[PDB]
């Protein structure tokens, strides 16, 4: 409890932004304005969750410390106003739940995650990644399980789990779009490989690049990463690139629709026909029913939804 106030820091890249705090003594990372708020915390490397609610004496947050804090607690507001404003959603639940992330987890630790209830940032090794919470797509994106995981429960297994996947990287890619910094179609790039210019974990225009499949006929069907759910993503997140942007893909020609319009489509998908067990050829029916609510049978929507799927072997 206390009184709503706005604090300045930088983030991971060096950018300076306002966030919102909350005095009571210290200043607190607990953004009031945003449903039932948004609420960080330090994990201080350890494993141990959520660890403490961030407390700060002035206010400011220049510290090096500092800086994956800020951006986990802006980059949640940011996809928090991209769901209110973009889709009428409130929060992950759609009743605006408190959103809590916890930074500085553990020592290394080279990921992020949604963990059934928060959100989960490593710090990186400084080598593969440095702090995960300075990307946007990558905040965006495990912000997006937890909405999933209150709509359509896609099971973190096979195809269902590579839906699961390619919709946290759809909206992920949506909300840096939103903030419009620096967008583009692919994952991860701000935070990956420091030493390393032009790459990302994965790519949504061109999949291959990072060794995932862009086609039916190259999905993996191993054990491996719950058998491929950050792979096989790679068939969906190409068939989204191409009904949002178009393109000719093993020789089938998709006219493009735009972001605004893939984003409708995918949110009505998941919120409207998807269930935990949903396949690709259940996802491009669903896909193909919301473009059809939403723009009629005949339109270029329902046909460019179509020829993507097609051009990617579903
Ligand atoms: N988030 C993906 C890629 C990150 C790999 C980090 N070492 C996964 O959990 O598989
Ligand atoms: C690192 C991030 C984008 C995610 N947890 C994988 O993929
Ligand atoms: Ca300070
Ligand atoms: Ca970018
Ligand atoms: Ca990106
Ligand atoms: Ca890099
Ligand atoms: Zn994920």
Redesign the pocket.
């Known amino acids: 409890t206390g009184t709503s106030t706005v604090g300045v820091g930088r983030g991971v890249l060096g950018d300076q932004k306002n966030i919102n705090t909350t005095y009571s003594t210290y200043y607190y990372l607990q953004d009031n304005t945003r449903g039932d708020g948004i609420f960080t915390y330090d994990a201080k490397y350890r494993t141990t969750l959520p660890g403490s609610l961030w407390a700060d004496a002035d206010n400011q947050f220049f510290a090096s410390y500092d800086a994956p804090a800020v951006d986990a607690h802006y980059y949640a507001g940011v996809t928090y106003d991209y769901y209110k404003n973009v889709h009428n959603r409130l929060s992950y639940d759609g009743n605006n739940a408190a959103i809590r992330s916890s930074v500085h987890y553990s020592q290394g630790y080279n990921?992020?995650?949604w963990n059934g209830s928060e959100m989960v940032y490593g710090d990186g090794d400084g080598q593969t990644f440095i702090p995960?919470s300075g990307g946007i797509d990558?905040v965006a994106?495990?912000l997006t399980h937890a909405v999933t995981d209150y709509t359509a429960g896609l099971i973190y297994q096979n195809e269902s789990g590579a839906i699961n996947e390619a919709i946290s990287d759809i909206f992920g890619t949506l909300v840096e779009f939103y903030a419009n910094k620096n967008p583009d179609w692919e994952?991860?790039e701000d935070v990956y490989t420091p030493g390393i210019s032009g790459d990302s974990?994965r790519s949504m225009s061109d999949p291959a690049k990072y060794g995932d499949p862009d086609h039916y006929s190259k999905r993996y069907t191993g054990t491996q990463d719950n058998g491929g759910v950050?792979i096989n993503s790679g068939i969906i997140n190409k068939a989204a690139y191409l009904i949002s942007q178009g393109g000719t893909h093993y020789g089938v020609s998709v006219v493009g629709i735009g972001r605004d319009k893939l984003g409708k489509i995918f949110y009505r998908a998941l919120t409207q026909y998807l269930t935990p067990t949903s396949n690709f050829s259940q996802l491009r029916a669903a896909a193909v029913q919301s473009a059809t609510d939403l723009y009629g049978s005949t339109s270029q929507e329902v046909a460019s939804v179509k020829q993507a799927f097609d051009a990617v072997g579903v």
Request: charged share 10%; hydrophobic share 55%.
């Open positions: 990921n992020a995650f995960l990558v994106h495990e994952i991860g974990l950050h």
